[PDB]
Amino acid sequence: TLSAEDKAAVERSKMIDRNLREDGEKAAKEVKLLLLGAGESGKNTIVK
């Protein structure tokens, strides 16, 4: 029905997808903030 290489490809795809799910779940839990202004805008000081 399927070749041994075919099963190996299937389980490799499943492992890749599982890792992708874990990485997406991890990336879901953080807050992304976009910092804007100018060089002499206190931007560096506020980063400090």
């Binding site: 839990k29 953080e30 807050v31 992304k32 903030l33 976009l34 910092l35 804007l36 202004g37 100018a38 060089g39 002499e40 805008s41 206190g42 931007k43 000081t45 506020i46 980063v47």
Partner: protein
Amino acid sequence: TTGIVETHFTFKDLYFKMFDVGAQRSERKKWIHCFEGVTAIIFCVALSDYDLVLAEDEEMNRMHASMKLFDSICNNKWFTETSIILFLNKKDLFEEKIKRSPLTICYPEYTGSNTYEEAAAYIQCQFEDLNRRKDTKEIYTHFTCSTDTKNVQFVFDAVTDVIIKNNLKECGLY
């Protein structure tokens, strides 16, 4: 090297990530849609820049340029539901320079005294009134300085408010 700068920090069990894009000296209408899904936009404006002038034009106050940039990024077609956290910086230099020079130098129709509070509230109002979309986004304003950690506290509280209101809108309860 140049490019976007990425910063991480944990505060009260939340992992804040911030992206500095000041190094991008090019057209912003080609990469700003990458940050469409951000919780908040932290905008820094130096209060002591009303007396200063940008040397590029020699007739251009840096405060007017800051106002233009804030308005452009606030009413963008992509940030129609994104909150903005304003940081009015260098309050002390403003405190002495308002004693030296009035705010009329920047806004010709100020019509006020030289005290810190009136001018501070005036600049805050002039910035916040540039928010044409007064329904689906909010501006949280601070005055920073104090050489302390209250800034991260303000950012944390504002982000928590943004998250809660996002959930409320998703539920329809707001």
